Each structure stands twice: as C-alpha cells, then as structure tokens.
Coordinates of C-alpha atoms in Angstrom, one line a residue:
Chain A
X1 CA -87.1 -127.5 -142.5
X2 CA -88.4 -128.3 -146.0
X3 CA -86.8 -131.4 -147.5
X4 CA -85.3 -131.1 -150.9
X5 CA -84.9 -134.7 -152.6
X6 CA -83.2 -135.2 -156.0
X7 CA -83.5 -138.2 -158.1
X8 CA -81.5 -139.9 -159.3
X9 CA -78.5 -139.5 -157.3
X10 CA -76.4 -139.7 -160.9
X11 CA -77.0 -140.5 -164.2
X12 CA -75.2 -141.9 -167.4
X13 CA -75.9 -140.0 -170.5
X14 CA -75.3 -139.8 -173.8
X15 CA -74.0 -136.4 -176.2
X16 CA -77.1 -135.0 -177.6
X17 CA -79.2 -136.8 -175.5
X18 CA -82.6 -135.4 -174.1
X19 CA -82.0 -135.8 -170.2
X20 CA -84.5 -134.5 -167.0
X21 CA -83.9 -134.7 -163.8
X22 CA -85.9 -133.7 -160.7
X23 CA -86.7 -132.5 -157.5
X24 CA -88.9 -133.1 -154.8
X25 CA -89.7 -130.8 -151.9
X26 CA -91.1 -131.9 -148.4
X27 CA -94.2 -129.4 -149.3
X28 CA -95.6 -126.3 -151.6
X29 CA -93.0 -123.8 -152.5
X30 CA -94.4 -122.0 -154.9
X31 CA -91.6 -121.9 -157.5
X32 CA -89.4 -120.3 -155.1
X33 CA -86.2 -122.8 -156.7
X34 CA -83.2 -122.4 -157.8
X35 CA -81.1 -125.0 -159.7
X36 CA -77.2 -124.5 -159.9
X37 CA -74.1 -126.6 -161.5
X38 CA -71.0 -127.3 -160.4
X39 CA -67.9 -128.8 -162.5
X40 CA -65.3 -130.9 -160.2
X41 CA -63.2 -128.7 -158.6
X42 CA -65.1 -124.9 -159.6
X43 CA -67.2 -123.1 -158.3
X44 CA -71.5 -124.0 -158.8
X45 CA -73.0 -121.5 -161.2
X46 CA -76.2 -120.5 -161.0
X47 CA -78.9 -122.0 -163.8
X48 CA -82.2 -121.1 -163.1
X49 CA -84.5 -119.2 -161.0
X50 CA -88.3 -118.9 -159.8
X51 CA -88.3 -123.1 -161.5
X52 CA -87.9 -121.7 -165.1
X53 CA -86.1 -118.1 -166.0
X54 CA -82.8 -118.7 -166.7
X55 CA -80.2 -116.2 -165.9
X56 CA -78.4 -114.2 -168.4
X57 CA -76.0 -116.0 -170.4
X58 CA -77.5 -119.8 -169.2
X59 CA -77.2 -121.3 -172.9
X60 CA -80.8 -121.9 -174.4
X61 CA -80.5 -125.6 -174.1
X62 CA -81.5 -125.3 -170.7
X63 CA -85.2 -125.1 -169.1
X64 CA -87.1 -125.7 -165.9
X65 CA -90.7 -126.6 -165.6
X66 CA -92.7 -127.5 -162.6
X67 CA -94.8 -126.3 -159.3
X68 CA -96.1 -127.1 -156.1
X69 CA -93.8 -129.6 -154.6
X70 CA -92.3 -131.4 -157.8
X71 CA -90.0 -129.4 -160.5
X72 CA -87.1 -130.8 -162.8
X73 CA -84.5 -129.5 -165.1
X74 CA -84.2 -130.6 -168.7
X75 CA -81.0 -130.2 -171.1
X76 CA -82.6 -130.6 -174.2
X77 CA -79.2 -132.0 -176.3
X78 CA -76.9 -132.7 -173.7
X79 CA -73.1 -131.1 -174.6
X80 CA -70.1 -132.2 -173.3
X81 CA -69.7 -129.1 -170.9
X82 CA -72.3 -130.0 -169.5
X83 CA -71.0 -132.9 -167.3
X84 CA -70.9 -132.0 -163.4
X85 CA -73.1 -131.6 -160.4
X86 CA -76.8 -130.4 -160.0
X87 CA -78.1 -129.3 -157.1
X88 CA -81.7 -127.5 -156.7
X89 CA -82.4 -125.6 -153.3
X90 CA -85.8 -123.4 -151.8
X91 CA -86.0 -119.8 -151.1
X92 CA -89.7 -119.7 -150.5
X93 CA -89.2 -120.2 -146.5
X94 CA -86.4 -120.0 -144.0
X95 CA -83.9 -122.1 -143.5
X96 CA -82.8 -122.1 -146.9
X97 CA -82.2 -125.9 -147.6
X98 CA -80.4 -127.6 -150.7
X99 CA -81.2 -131.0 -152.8
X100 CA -78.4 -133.2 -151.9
X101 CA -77.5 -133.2 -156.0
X102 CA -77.6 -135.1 -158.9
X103 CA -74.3 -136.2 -160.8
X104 CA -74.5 -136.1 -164.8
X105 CA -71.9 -138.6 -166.2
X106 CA -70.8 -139.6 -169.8
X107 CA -71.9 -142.7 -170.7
X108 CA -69.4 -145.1 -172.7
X109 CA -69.3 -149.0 -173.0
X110 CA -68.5 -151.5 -170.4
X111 CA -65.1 -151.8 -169.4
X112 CA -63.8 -154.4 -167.0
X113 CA -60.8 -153.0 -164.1
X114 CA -57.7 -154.6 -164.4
X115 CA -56.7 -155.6 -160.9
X116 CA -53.1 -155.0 -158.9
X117 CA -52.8 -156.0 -155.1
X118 CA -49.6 -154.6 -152.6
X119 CA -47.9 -155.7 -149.6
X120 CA -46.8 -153.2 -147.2
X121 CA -43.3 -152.2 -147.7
X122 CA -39.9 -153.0 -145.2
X123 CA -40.0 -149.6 -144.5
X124 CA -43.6 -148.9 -143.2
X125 CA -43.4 -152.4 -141.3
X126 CA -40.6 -151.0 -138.9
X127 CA -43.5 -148.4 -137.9
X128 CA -45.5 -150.6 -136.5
X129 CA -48.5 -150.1 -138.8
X130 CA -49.2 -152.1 -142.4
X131 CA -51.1 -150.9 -145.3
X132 CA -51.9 -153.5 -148.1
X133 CA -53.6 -151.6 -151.4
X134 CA -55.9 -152.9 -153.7
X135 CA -56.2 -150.9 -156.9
X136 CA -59.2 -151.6 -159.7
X137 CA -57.9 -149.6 -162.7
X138 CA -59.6 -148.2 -165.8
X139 CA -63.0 -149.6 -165.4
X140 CA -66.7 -148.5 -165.9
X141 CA -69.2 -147.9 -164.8
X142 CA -68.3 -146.3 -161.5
X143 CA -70.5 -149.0 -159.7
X144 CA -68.3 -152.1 -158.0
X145 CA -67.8 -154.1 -155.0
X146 CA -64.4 -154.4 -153.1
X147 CA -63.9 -157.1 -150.3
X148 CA -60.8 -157.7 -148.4
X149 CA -60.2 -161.4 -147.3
X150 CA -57.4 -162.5 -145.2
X151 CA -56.6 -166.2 -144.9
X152 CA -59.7 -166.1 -146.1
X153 CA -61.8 -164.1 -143.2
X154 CA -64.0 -161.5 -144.2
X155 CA -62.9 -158.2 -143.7
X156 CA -64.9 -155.5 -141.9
X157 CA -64.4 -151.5 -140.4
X158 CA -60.9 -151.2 -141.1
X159 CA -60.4 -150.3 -144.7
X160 CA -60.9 -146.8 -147.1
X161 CA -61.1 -146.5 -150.5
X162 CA -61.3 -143.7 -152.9
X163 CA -62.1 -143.3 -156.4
X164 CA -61.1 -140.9 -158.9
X165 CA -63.2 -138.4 -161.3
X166 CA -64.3 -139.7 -164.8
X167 CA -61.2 -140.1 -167.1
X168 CA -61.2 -137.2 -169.8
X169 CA -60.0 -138.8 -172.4
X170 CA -61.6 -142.5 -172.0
X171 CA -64.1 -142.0 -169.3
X172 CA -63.1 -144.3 -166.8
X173 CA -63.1 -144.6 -163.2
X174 CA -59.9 -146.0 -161.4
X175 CA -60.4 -147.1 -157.4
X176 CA -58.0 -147.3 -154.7
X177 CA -59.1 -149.5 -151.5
X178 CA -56.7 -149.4 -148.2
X179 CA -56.5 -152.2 -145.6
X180 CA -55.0 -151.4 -142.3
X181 CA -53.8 -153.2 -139.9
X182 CA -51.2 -153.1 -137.1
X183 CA -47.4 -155.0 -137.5
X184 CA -48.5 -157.5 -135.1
X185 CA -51.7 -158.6 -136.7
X186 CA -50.0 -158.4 -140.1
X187 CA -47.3 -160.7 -139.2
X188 CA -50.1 -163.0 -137.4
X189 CA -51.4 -164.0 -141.1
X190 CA -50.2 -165.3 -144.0
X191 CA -52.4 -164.7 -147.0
X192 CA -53.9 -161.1 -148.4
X193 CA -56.9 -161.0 -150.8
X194 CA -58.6 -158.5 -152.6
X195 CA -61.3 -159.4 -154.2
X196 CA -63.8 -157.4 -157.1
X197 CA -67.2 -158.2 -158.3
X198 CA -67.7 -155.6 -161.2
X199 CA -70.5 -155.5 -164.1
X200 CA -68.0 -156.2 -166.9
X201 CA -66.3 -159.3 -165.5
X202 CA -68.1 -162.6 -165.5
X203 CA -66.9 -163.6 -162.2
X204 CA -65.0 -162.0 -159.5
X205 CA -61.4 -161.2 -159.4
X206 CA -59.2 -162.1 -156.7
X207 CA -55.7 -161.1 -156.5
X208 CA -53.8 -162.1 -153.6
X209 CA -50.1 -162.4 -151.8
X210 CA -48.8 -164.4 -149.3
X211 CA -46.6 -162.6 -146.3
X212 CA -42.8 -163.3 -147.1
Chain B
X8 CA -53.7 -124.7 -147.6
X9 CA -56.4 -122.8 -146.1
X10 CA -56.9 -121.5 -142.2
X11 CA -56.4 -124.1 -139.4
X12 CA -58.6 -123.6 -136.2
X13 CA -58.6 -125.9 -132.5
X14 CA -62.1 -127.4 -132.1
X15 CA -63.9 -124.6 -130.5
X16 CA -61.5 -122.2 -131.4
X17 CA -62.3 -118.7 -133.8
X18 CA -62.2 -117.2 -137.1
X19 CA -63.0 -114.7 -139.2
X20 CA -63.4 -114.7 -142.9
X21 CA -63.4 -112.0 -144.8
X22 CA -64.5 -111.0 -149.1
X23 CA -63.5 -107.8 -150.6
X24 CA -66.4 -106.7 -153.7
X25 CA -65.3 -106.1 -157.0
X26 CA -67.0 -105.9 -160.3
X27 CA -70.3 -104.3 -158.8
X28 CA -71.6 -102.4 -156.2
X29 CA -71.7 -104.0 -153.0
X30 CA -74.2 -102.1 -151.2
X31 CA -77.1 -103.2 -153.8
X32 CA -77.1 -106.9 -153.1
X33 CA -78.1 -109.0 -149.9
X34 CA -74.5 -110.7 -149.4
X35 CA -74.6 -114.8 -148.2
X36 CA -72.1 -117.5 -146.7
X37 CA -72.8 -120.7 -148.1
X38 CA -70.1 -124.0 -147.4
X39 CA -69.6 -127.3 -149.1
X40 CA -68.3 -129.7 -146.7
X41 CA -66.1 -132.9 -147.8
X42 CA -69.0 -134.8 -149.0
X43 CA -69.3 -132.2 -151.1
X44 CA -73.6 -131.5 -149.8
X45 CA -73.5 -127.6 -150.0
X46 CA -75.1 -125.9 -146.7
X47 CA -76.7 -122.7 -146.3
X48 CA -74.2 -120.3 -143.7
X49 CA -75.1 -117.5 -142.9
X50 CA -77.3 -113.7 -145.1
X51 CA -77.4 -110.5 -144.9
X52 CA -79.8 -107.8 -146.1
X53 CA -78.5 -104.9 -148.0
X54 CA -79.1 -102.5 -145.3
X55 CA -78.1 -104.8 -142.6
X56 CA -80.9 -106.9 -141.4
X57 CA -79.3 -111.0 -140.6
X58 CA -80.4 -114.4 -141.2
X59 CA -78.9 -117.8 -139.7
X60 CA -79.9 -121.7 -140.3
X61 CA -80.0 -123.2 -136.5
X62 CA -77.2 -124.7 -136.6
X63 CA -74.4 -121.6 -136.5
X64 CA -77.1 -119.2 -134.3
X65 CA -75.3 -117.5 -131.5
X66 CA -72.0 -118.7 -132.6
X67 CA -71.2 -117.3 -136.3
X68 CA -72.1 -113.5 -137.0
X69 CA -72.2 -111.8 -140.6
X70 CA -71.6 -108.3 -140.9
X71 CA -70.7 -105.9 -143.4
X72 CA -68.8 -102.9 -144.8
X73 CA -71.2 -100.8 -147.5
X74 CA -68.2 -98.0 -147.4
X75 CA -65.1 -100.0 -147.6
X76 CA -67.5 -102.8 -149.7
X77 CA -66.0 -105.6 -147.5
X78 CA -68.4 -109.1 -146.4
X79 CA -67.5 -110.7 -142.9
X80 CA -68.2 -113.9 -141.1
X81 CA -66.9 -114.1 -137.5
X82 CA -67.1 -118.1 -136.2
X83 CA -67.0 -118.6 -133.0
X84 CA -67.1 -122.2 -131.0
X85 CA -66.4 -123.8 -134.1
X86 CA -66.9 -127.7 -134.2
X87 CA -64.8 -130.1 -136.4
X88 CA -68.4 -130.8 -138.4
X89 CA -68.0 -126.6 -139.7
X90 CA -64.6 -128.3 -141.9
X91 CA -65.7 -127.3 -145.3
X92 CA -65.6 -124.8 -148.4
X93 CA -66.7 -121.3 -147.3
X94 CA -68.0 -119.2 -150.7
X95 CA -69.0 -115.6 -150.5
X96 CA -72.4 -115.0 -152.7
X97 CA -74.5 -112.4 -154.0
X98 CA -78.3 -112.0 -154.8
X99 CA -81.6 -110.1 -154.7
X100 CA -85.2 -110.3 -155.4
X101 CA -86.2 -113.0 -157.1
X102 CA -83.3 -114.3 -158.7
X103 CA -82.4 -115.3 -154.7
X104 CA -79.7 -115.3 -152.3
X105 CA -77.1 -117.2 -154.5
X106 CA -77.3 -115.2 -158.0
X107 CA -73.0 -114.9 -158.2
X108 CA -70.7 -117.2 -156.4
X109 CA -67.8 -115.4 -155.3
X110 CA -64.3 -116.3 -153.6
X111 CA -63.9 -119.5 -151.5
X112 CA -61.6 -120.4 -148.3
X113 CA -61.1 -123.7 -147.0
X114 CA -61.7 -123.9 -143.4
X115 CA -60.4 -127.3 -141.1
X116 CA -61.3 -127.4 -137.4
X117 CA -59.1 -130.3 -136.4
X118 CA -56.7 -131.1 -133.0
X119 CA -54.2 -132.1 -135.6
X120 CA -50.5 -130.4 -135.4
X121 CA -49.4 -129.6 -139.4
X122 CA -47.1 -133.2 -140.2
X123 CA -45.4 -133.3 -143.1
X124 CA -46.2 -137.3 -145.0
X125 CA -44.3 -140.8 -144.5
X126 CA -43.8 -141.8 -148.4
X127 CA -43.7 -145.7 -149.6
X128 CA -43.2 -147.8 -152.3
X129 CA -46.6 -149.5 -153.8
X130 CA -44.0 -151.9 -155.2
X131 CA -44.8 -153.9 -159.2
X132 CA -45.6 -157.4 -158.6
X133 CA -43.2 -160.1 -159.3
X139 CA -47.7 -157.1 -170.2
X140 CA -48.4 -154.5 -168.4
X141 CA -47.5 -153.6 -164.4
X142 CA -49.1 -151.3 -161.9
X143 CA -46.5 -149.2 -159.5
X144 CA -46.8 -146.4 -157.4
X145 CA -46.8 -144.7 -154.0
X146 CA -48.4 -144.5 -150.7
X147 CA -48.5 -140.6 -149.3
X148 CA -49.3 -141.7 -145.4
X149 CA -50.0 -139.7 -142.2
X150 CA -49.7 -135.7 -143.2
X151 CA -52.0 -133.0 -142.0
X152 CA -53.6 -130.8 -143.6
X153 CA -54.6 -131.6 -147.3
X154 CA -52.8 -130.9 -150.1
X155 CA -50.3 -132.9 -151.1
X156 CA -48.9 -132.7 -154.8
X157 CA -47.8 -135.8 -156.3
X158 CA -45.8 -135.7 -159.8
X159 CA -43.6 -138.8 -161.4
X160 CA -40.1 -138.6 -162.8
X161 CA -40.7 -134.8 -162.2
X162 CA -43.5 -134.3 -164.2
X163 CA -41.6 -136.3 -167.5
X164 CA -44.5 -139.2 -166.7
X165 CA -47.8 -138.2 -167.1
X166 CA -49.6 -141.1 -169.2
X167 CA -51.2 -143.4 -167.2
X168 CA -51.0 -141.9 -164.1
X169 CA -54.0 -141.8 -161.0
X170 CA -53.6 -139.8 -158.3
X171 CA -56.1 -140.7 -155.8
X172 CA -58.5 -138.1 -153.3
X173 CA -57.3 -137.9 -150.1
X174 CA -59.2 -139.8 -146.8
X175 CA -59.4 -138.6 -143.4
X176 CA -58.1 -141.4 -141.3
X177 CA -59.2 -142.1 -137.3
X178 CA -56.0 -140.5 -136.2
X179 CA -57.2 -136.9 -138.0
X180 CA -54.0 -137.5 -140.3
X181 CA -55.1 -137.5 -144.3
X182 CA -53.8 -140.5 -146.7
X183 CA -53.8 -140.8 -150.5
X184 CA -51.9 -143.0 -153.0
X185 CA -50.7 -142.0 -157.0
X186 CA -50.4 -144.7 -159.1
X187 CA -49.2 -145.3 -163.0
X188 CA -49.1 -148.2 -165.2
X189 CA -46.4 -149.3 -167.4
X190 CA -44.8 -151.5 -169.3
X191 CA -43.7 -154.7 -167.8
X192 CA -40.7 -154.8 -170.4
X193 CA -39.6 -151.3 -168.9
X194 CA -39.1 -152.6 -165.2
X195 CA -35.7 -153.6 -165.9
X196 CA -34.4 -150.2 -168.3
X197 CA -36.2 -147.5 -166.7
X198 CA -36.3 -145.3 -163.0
X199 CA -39.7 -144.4 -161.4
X200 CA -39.5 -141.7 -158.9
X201 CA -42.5 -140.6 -157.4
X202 CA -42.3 -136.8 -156.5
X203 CA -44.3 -135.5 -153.2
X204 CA -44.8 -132.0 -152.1
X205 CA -46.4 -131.1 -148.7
X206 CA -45.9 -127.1 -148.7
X207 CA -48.1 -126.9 -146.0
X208 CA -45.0 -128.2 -143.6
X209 CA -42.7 -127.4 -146.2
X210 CA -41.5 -131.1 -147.0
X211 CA -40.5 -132.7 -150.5
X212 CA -39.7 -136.2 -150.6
X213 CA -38.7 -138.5 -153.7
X214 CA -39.5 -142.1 -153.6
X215 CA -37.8 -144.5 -156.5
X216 CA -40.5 -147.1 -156.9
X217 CA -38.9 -150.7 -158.2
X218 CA -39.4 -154.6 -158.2
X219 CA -38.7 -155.9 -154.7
Chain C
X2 CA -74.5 -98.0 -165.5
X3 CA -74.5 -98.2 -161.7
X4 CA -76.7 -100.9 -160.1
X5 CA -79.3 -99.5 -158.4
X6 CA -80.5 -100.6 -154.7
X7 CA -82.3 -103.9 -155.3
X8 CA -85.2 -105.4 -153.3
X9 CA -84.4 -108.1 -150.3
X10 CA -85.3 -112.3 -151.9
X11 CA -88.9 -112.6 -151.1
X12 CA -88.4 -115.6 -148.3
X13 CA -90.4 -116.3 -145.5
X14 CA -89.9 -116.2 -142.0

C-alpha cells in the first residue's frame, strides 16, 4: 500500500493569509492525486486532480503544484469558507489510499478556559455508577492538558473527554472531560480534582470538591 | 439514525442516480469512520468490471443497475471496525474515482440493544456559573439536546458524543449564565432520543 | 447534452 502523509496535522491561519500544505507519498505517483475538502458535518468536495487542474467551479484561489512523491496545496488569500478538512489521496496504483488530513483553523488571540468541576448527582449514585465532569470553557488554542486527581492520586484509563468544533462567532474551543468511577470507589474518597495546564494561563488551574 | 447490524451480521446499501447518466461513470463506496480517516470501500467500472482494498475482499460485493441506474453494496460478515459513514461517488478518467460525492448512510455494527438515555443534573456550584446536563447510557447516536425548549441558545455547548466500554454512547450540553439569575430563573434541559422514541426534561438548579 | 461513455481512472493493478 502507498503511504500518504500530510503535514501538519492542523494549522492556525489568518484571513487573507498565503497558506500551503503538503503531502508525502511512500513512493512515485506520478501526479496521480487528488486533494478534497470537507466542512464539519458535509460532505468532502473534490479540489483538485492529476496534483494541479482544478475542477470546474474550484474558486481560482486555489492551486496544486508538485511530482514524484511530494505535492502540496496552496490557498493563495485564505477566505473564511475556506475553514475545514484537507485530505489528499493516490490513484496511480491500487489500493487506493488517503492522507490522514490536515485541519485549517482560524487563528484568533489567546484566550484562557474558565474552569467548572461536578459531583455526581443523588440520582446517578443510586445506580451504582458516578460520573464527576470537568468542563474547560471558551478557550484557545484547541491545545491543553486535563488531569484528574483524586485525594490527590493521579488518575489514569478511566476518563473521556470531548471537545467541540471552533466557535463561529468567537472561535473558541470548549472541552468536556468525564471521570468514571463505580459507587463504591466514589464513596471510598473524599476529594475530586480537575486540574488544566493551558497556554493562556500562567499556572495551572485546579478546581476541586470534596464528597458530602 | 442510520441501519443497525449484529457483528457479523448483513447489509445492503443501496444509491439511486440523479442529475446524470449513471451508466457513463465508474461508481465507488468510500466510508469515513468516527475518527473521521476516510477509507477507500469498494469501485466499479462502468461496464461492470470490480475493485476491492483487502480488507472487505470476499465479504462486501458492489454491483450495479445501468437500466434502473441504481449503485449496490452487499456487506456481508461485517465487523464492528466497518461502523462508519458510507458515501456513494462518481468519477472517470483522470479526474479519478471520487469526482462527485453523492448520498451518505450511517452504518453501526454493534451487540448493543437500542436504549433510550438516563438524564442528570451537571448541578451550578455553590459572576458568572456553569450548569448543565449529563445524557448517559443510550444507544445508538443521536441524541438532540435543547434548553428551556429552544428559548436558551446563548452560551450554550453541546458536546460530541463517546463510545463508552459498555457499547452505550455518552455526551453532556452545557450553558453559562448568570450567577445573579440562579435564584429568578428555571433551566430545563430538553433531550430527545427518537431512535427509542424517549423525551426527557431535566430542571437543572443549585443543590 | 447527454454524457457520453467515459474512460475507466487510469490506476494500476
């Protein structure tokens, strides 16, 4: 199978702003690539094909440029539209294989989360099960580090979290975390921390809560 | 929300043409699975010659229907790792495989029985507060989430779903607010689960 | 108007 890498995996950028990014395959292809977009939750769209024609209607600010094994994809003046998911993928052999993508992101100033912990409600606690959430909201850039701590123990294999798409109207990220953990551990403890290290805060935050 | 199969159970998909003319273009399955990496499926020449990646040889056939302009994809012995997005595509010649994306179907291979979702209170802590809910244990995805039936909007995050270790999906909706409204006003999360037809409402308030 | 019959993607293999 040829290997298709993309770099970087995601990118801030500015409106207006020149931006290229690029694609690596595992060997020759001979221009045989196509590059396609996709906006959070459409369908991709189809950019370019044979590394630098651009199908009908693909707006002009648009080109692709490369050979061999390494090609990339330039928006010239990046427009706000233009903000979603790139992916490049080989046709010159069989299996057909995809890049893994690259994420295009508007770039904004720092903004620091503003923290909220939760204990698990009466309710869930007569199921047997406790969920304590940790939610980091409003923030940016996407990039940030969650820890759970309990009586002050390191935490490890038994939390989620998820993170929302970029904010339309301020372009901020906002991050829910999950710790599980069964009635009879949860009662076993008394105090729940969550604690964020984040680029915009000039030491970590802790919230915490003690059981009852 | 989409077709449920048994791990290695069977399916077939199916994508009606419209807008050209079917029997001109090779036709393709492609799938986006939940971390959203797109795969290659399945192709299929104009006059009927087949490709497949590996991974779905001897278990998924495409076929297709140049009078009736209809694109098939029987799935046979299908494995919770073929979950995923399944798009219908057109192309030729140089332009390849994937010219025009066409319509998608969400397929889940899970042991999961359809469960309608536990709802709880992610209660404000004793200027501004943080509320909302936790949407727990429900299967399959999606769950709708709207606040003081759709009268509070500002402020709010509804989070993607995750798959926990029991095969059951989880997800939380959040809002912020005024800490001066927790006394005056009523927050009532709103949660729809049409997939086991269940509507719950949750009033969200300081313990 | 109507699309003619259009040659196979040129992929190897």
């Amino acid at each position: 199978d040829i290997k298709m890498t993309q770099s970087p995996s995601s990118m801030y950028a500015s409106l207006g702003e020149r931006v290229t990014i690029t694609c690596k395959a595992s060997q020759d292809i001979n221009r045989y690539l196509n590059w396609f977009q996709q906006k959070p939750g459409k369908s991709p769209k189809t950019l370019i094909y044979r590394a630098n024609r651009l199908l009908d209607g693909v707006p002009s600010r648009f080109s692709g440029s490369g050979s061999g094994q390494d090609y990339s994809l330039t928006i010239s003046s990046l427009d706000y539209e233009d903000m979603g998911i790139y992916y490049c993928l080989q046709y010159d052999e069989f299996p057909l294989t995809f890049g893994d993508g690259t994420k295009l992101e508007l770039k904004r100033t720092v903004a620091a989360p503003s923290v909220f912990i939760f204990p698990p409600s009466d309710e869930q606690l007569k199921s047997g099960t406790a969920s304590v959430v940790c939610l980091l909201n409003n923030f940016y850039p996407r990039e940030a580090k969650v820890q759970w701590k309990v009586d002050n123990a390191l935490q490890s294999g038994n939390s989620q979290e998820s993170v929302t798409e970029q904010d339309s109207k301020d372009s901020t990220y906002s991050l829910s975390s999950t710790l599980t953990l069964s009635k009879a551990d949860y009662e076993k403890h008394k105090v729940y921390a969550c604690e964020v290290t984040h680029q915009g805060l000039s030491s970590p935050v802790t919230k915490s809560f003690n059981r009852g | 929300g989409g077709d449920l199969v048994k791990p290695g159970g069977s399916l077939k998909l199916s994508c009606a043409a419209s807008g050209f003319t079917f029997s001109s273009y090779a036709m393709s399955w492609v799938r986006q699975n939940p971390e959203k990496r797109l795969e290659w499926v399945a192709s299929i020449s104009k006059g009927g010659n087949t490709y497949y990646p590996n991974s779905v040889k001897g278990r998924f056939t495409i076929s297709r229907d140049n009078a009736r302009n209809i694109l098939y994809l029987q799935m046979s012995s299908l494995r919770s790792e073929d979950t995923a997005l399944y798009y219908c595509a057109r192309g030729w010649g140089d332009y390849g495989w994937f010219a025009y994306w066409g319509q998608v179907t969400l397929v889940t291979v899970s042991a999961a029985s359809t469960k309608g979702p536990s709802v709880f209170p992610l209660a404000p802590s004793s200027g501004t507060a943080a509320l909302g809910c936790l949407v727990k244990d429900y299967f399959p995805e999606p769950v709708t989430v709207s606040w003081n039936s759709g009268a509070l909007t500002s402020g709010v995050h509804t989070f993607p779903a995750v798959l926990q270790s029991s095969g059951l999906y989880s997800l939380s909706s959040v809002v912020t607010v005024p800490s001066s409204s927790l006394g005056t006003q009523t927050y009532i999360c709103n949660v729809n689960h049409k997939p086991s037809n269940t509507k719950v409402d949750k009033k969200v308030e300081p313990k | 108007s109507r699309t003619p019959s259009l040659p196979t993607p040129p992929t190897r293999e």
